[PDB]
Amino acid sequence: SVYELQVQKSVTVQEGLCVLVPCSFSYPWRSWYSSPPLYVYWFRDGEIPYYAEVVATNNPDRRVKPETQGRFRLLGDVQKKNCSLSIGDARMEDTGSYFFRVERGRDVKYSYQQNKLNLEVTALIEKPDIHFLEPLESGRPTRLSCSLPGSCEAGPPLTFSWTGNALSPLDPETTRSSELTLTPRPEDHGTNLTCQMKRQQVTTERTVQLNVSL
């Protein structure tokens, strides 16, 4: 059939993180002057287009499930066969089946029930990433940045909070910034530094053992 969709049938993301489902679609047109808007939609399996809220869509009229507003986002150009569903801030609840649909003019209307998707939202194991130039020299200010791999800025901003006896010397105020500059002491050497990240209730932290020197 001229109706065909390109996209892996099953997928998985760690809760709180975000995956990227590349997708592509074709549909019989009937080109010539006539150029009505092309609307596509992602729906949860089981729902009826006519009365369902989109999981994601480019139709500025169709309501979007409050649940997914901001997290499921269609990428690229649709005029260019692109139906890539960028899933963000995976939530256990998102686990499920999903179908795609196109609508153009009065006669092009179809839900690809042959090529469904399967989102599996597994628990979060990933731990942040503490990163510093590797100087680790006493009496010298260095900058550490903490980040969670494979994370989008789709959902509510992530929160940072460092920990370790090496922190007590500074202001409990600037211990909440993603990045943290520090000036180590002999005491700090061999101490545990930690970074915890939340999404505005997960457990993600990376503790590193300091190697201050000279």
Does the annotation list 109 as a binding residue? yes
Does the annotation list 97 as a binding residue? no
Residue 162, helix vs strand vs coil = strand
Domains of the chain: 1-125 (2.60.40.10), 126-214 (2.60.40.10)
- Resolution, rounded to a tenth of an Å? 2.8
Technique behind the model: X-ray
Does the annotation list 116 as a binding residue? no
CA dist 40 and 34 (Å) reads 18
Residue 93, helix vs strand vs coil = helix
- Give the start-end residues of each E strand in 134-191: 142-147, 159-163, 179-182
CA dist 152 and 143 (Å) reads 23
Closest CA to 56 of 39, 75, 70, 41: 41
Q: Exposed, middle or buried: residue 31 (CB in 10 Å: 0-12, 13-18, 19+)?
A: exposed
CA dist 65 and 83 (Å) reads 18
Whether 57 contacts 75, CB under 8 Å: no
CA dist 213 and 117 (Å) reads 53
Residue partners of 69: CB distance under 8 A and separation at least 6? none
- Give the start-end residues of each E strand in the chain: 4-6, 11-14, 24-26, 38-44, 56-57, 72-74, 85-87, 96-104, 108-111, 117-122, 129-131, 142-147, 159-163, 179-182, 192-198, 205-209
Direct distance between the N- and C-terminal alpha carbons of the chain, in angstroms, rounded to an integer: 71
C-alpha distances (whole Å) from 114 to each of 53, 107, 181 are: 21, 20, 53
- Other residues' Cβ atoms within 10 Å of the Cβ of residue 117: 23
